[PDB]
Symmetry: D3
């Protein structure tokens, strides 16, 4: 009775308005403030093409703007119908990679590429969306995480990994690519500079336990229980002050992210200020064309 | 006519017939668009719908390969008092305790009570910052509060000699932009002047701001968009690839890992163009070892 | 010709023992005046001066009815009529271990049992970190560490006739390798900051205003009057917004410390909310918190 | 004969001038250049109120200015006389927490709060004192380290922890609070971004060994020996060049702390320069109203 | 079982370096890998200024060798005096003066050229390793102490001898400090708590202990240390050299501020120079005509 | 009207083989003059030029009797009389792999077995990291990489009549994405720096002085005379303090590299102390060090 599949169909419901998804699935939990967002191209180890990225962005953006959702679980569906192989995500689909980047195609192969249309590298936009969203994103690595798939794991707030099937392999340099942003530099902020350089320069395959020991994986779970454990972590996150959780995420981001990090954290501080009687007096005085009266509000130190 | 806008020079854009708070035009000849606040009756204050329209329009420009430069400005003058404005920031009428709120009308009476406020002009700031194209702010009048902060985050600023007025009113109404509006202003005028601008909230002219370092050039009001178009033409006459890389180089360190992500992203694209990268792709697809021998190690 | 208007200022409780510094509170406004009081040596500071200055600024920091600090120098010199804001560390009591405590004014009375100090750096941080605007009124010479004190203040107003900026550090084998130099570059740019230190030339108020280190130039007799006006414009705004803005300006330049100060004020803002009060109450009442009344914002 | 208490009364003497302390204890070692600074409210798991913070600052400042002291051991007294429970520090005293921060009170409970007096969050001032003092501060975690107590451990230079009784738990978001400075961001500089995020977002309880494995605890010690081991570490620190140790602490702080970090490190470099004949010639030339003669001093490269 | 990691059959001397005294320099007989090693095992491979000069010269030559992808940095041994093993024990204290480490005609302080100021220019070697567009693997075959420990830290990767590696940061014991890559950058490997412990207490750590803390990538048997180094180098050399170059500079970038940006952006400029668009910019200038950018799309 | 005064400068031993660069030491002062010597092509540099420039600057770095470097360009052009500081990389030998070594002046003598290089970046770092002030004397056109060299120098003086600043990078499909651009913004601010690169307009000495990238404007004939005066003011200060100050200005902008350089100078200062000597002596004498004479400063 041991399931080879982490997905419990009884626990999840399709989100309204997303019937047209082909490369991604999107579910909301039947009880919890948690959604499940998953790659749905297991025949190519869940490699993403530009359409995949567009769907992924659309889905994550919707989750971001859903007030009754606290946590995103990002994972990959499977296994491959071809060989039963398991994957989180193997990065950009090499079949439609051109000299200008990953290209839109009418089919799955290079011969169907729209030659009039420039390639894109916009999984980077999805990276920023994950980074900047005021909600915890937990990567559930259920299989291979390679290339840009590895880098997506890196930029998520937390990572849980399948004991049996998770395999971490940074294959970028093998195919003449590189993620010189969050995939590499930010990995060093998890495992340190020596281990991060080893991971990219040699491109070896690592287990869930090895990545846990190095600092890039928060916990290892049994494959069949990976989403169950993800849901437990999500519930612990959702049981705290959502205001504090939001502020904490942006505090962790801040200095690493320079002025952008400051912008996001300060933006949340501005919102906190808007809630105060003092900010309301500022608004009211402007609207009423009168001098503001700040006397009720002390100079804290 | 003392209006900067030359109707004959601009054309409407497919898909934007529904715009109400913003106007969007593409130049008749040039690789340049004109994006403008269109609520001059309230000094071009933005409400959340304005922000949505502005984001949509700028995102469209970003994804338009035949467009190299964005001119960001405000329409005018006010039909009520003839006052000129670039943008006076967030519309205070619909500001609530949770931020700026959606409303069916122009005033607080019609705010959707079930819907939390937003501060998402910050998303527009990031869109301007991260887009691989030069954004020139044309300050044609009052630039106050969040309007002032939009001017600050733009790559370049041209301002009307007669009518541009820079006034950072944030602290007057109990608000603050603690990101690009303040800290990034200091990277233009220095810390002393930036602090003065915010702490005292005085009104400055185009010439004064040019002297401090936040305004690139001062133009006659009637000529502001003509000068903007000339600046755009000089930008568009250079290597688009070089211009792209330069913008992200200027952003990089100030923007930390995000800046690195954007610049490195462009470097990845440059690498994908190489025969070496194509060999990496081909070897994977052909299930064979790559042959790197033709590609020398540079130093 | 003196910038000081005695009628506008009152003494402060608990500071009757001050010798090197003066400290006044404005008669009407939420503004204090903090001034070097050693004009016979161009207002050079000794370690006792630094201790007094720290004490006074800390007091102003903790005074809820004070919004703005005017930092300046008294004068003129009774000996030659020269005007000074501050000429930096008192070289008379400078030793190999830094500036030394002495019972008198010269090296003759240095306490041998006591190592030297460079703790004007503590005053620089106090100015930097305090949630109130500090305006330097440069009424005369600003040299060495006195020049660096001007640099670290939020704003600077300067006497047209008598302000003289001269970074003499390298002339006497010293250097401010922190706020005095690197932060000067964040005001006038790297080229001008390097020029100011490497050549140590004398600059006027107008020249420094042109470079970006002086906010405005005022007539000498009006310097404190103009300072009070600036203070009044500052004090007419939201105290909360002003606090947040100062820390936002500091933040990234100050790394984790800047984040600590800014995030600290964000924490205070959070504590004011009903959501934070429920967190407190639930803990005190030994029950689970109920977060359902509080929407997730985006 | 196994002691339940790490404190060895025979090894410590009260510091003169501190008879009025109520919330904090302060001892100097009978032989070593080491002091012991401890929370003294074990009945509420060594939670600090604003008076506690004032005493803590006073004591740490005195240690800072004591030239015959090289190392500070920061710990908590105990156990609770109520239930025998052990704590390092449980953060801000929630009983006197109000909308403006932690408030001064005449008693221990909310009804004795001076309502006319604004609240403070000035444990942040103690964090900076620990960070900026030119001496090594070793946290000895002898029990619960929760909330602000956890953040104090994080900002110390080194941490040793009780095998049996140390418990690390970041409860901030549970009570709607957050440390968005050293408590969170700087924790990431010890355990990496993934683990730091886990510690705050889930607020689980961790053992000494778990925190040691993640990188936030330097070593685990037997509870009875925790202060003995702390003293041994202090003795190894005090056996080296005090000048080098000072420069090293500020080197470690420097870049994480931006211009403030630079100020502190450059300030010590200025001190080193003042010791030189070249600097003395600069002083002498000024005092003697003559040009300086730099010819005896070679340019180095 | 060999007590020595060095396999003489696998290495050939590099031409032009027969005058080296304090350093050895070999090129692998088959691989794109060089071996650069301290050669003063009688004093635990402590470096003097001449050592630093030779080391810089050799590393600079490897940097400028297009047929070399990886540098293995290690120490020769054992000591003929006592059979002790060292990677590098840091600056030679015998010729340390008040102005830094001084050039000397001999081994001892009495042979120091007093007219010539001291230097601390192992820092120049640290920068050379940091900035070179090739992976440098430190093979810690024995003691790594003081400045020798800091060299280990600045390398891209470190492999260490199970039996003989010993890590000990003795700086503060002799009144010295590396307040740059040796300390601050160590914190970027093991975290701030462990890095502070390493410097403030100066304890000796094993290869396994440093591996657990995050400063050592892997532990190898002493006899196999260079064999494993060569295997790691081969894995590195089997990838796109262009990608490896960009990755190294991406890892350096933000930690290294504007200098990091300069190096990464430099490589980006090189990539741009390869494009037809860049060639059109050049051609238009040379041909005294306006450039035509119309063939080159804007990308987003 | 030539800025160069032949009677004031002497050749440096060991450099009679220079072809693209000239190198002189002042006959009286602790100052050297390093100049581009290809005025027929507006002083564009080829890889050999960069090699010579590095060699000469490195020699100046290691010369204890030299405190200041004046970096400039020789002229005028013998062909059209035009003046140049430096017009950047020589486009005649620019290839897809960078600037190429050639035995002659054009692409037809390029050695193809030799990959192109962009190693003016190495010279930029050498200028940045050398513990001496480098003053750029812009005597004419400063364009492309020549403009970026001006930017990275500590100070810039410029010819009123003939200095012309023009960032032509994007015009020829190139870009300096490091010190040339990002660091320019640390002198003139982000708006002006973006303007300079994105539009590539020509600016005068006075315009660049007003923006913050030129320290002072001088008459063309007096440009080196003024440079020597600035050098003399620099050389009249504590060389130790000047060294520390340069590295303090560099530090945070240069991250860990900045820290490495500044901390390295701090280590040297510590080595001078009796305390450090005791540490050395105890190790050499195989005995415990005695730190008791050395107080714990605060
Ligand atoms: C902009 C300024 C200085 C113009 O002065 P003036 O020439 O006197 O125009 P006037 O004040 O008469 O305003 C003209 C009309 O437009 C309205 N109006 C102007 N600006 C408005 C605004 N933001 N919201 C709503 N109505 C506005 C006015 O209420 C007035 O309406 P009526 O009298 O005809 O009924 C002067 O008008 C001014 O100071 N406006 C306020 C600028 C401001 O403070 N905005 C918010 C600051 S903070 C911010 O923008 C922000 C936003 C998002 C996030 C963070 C933020 O900090
Ligand atoms: C400020 C300046 C340029 C004024 O020059 P001048 O107008 O000609 O006045 P004068 O130089 O005659 O000074 C008037 C009297 O005050 C003394 N005096 C002035 N400044 C003094 C000072 N700092 N310390 C002790 N006595 C002082 C003078 O020795 C003189 O005394 P008498 O002849 O009447 O007996 C000119 O006075 C000047 O250059 N002063 C020195 C500027 C300076 O070098 N400050 C210290 C640099 S290092 C520093 O400040 C520092 C300290 C701690 C930490 C970091 C640091 O960088
Ligand atoms: C510390 C902890 C985990 C221990 O739990 P446990 O071992 O089960 O004991 P218990 O929870 O029963 O507490 C024992 C007694 O001490 C009180 N107590 C413990 N900590 C207290 C505290 N901070 N304030 C007031 N009373 C306290 C308790 O209320 C209880 O009192 P009685 O029932 O005997 O009457 C568990 O007690 C716990 O979770 N404590 C709270 C940790 C916490 O949330 N601190 C504040 C969070 S925010 C913060 O620390 C902070 C502070 C300043 C600035 C920024 C900040 O984020
Ligand atoms: C390396 C270490 C820990 C090994 O100790 P051990 O295995 O017990 O052997 P021993 O200490 O007897 O040393 C063996 C022989 O080599 C000499 N030796 C070893 N290292 C030396 C060194 N650096 N300088 C001169 N002679 C050395 C020794 O003096 C001894 O010679 P003899 O008694 O046979 O005549 C043990 O030897 C040790 O602790 N070495 C000290 C490493 C150190 O801390 N050096 C300077 C600190 S600062 C630094 O390293 C540095 C360097 C460059 C730039 C910046 C820097 O901060």
């Amino acid at each position: 009775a041991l399931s080879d599949n982490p997905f419990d169909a009884k626990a999840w419901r399709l989100v309204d308005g997303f019937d047209d998804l082909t490369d991604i699935t999107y579910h909301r939990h039947v009880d919890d403030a948690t959604v499940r967002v998953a790659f749905n191209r297991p025949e190519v180890r869940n490699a993403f093409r530009p359409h995949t990225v567009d769907e992924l962005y659309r889905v994550l953006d919707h989750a971001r703007m859903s007030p009754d959702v606290g946590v995103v679980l990002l994972t990959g569906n499977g296994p491959s119908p071809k060989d039963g192989g398991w994957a989180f995500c193997s990065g950009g689909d090499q079949r439609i990679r051109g000299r200008s980047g990953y290209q839109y195609a009418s089919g799955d192969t290079a011969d169907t590429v729209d030659v009039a249309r420039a390639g894109r590298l916009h999984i980077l936009e999805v990276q920023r969306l994950i980074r900047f969203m005021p909600k915890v994103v937990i990567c559930l690595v259920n299989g291979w995480a390679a290339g840009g798939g590895h880098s997506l794991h890196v930029v998520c707030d937390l990572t849980l990994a399948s004991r049996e099937y998770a395999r971490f392999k940074q294959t970028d340099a093998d195919v003449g690519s590189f993620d010189g942003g969050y995939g590499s530099a930010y990995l060093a902020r998890q495992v340190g500079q020596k281990f991060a350089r080893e991971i990219f320069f040699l491109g070896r395959t690592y287990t869930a336990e090895q990545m846990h020991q190095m600092g890039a994986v928060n916990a290892v779970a049994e494959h069949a229980e990976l989403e169950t454990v993800g849901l437990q972590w999500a519930a612990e996150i959702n049981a705290k002050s959502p205001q504090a959780q939001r502020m904490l995420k942006f505090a962790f981001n801040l200095l690493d992210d320079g002025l952008v990090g400051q912008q996001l954290f300060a933006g949340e501080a501005t919102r906190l200020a808007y809630m105060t009687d003092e900010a309301v007096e500022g608004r009211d005085a402007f609207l009423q064309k009168r001098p503001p009266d700040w006397s009720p509000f002390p100079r804290y130190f």
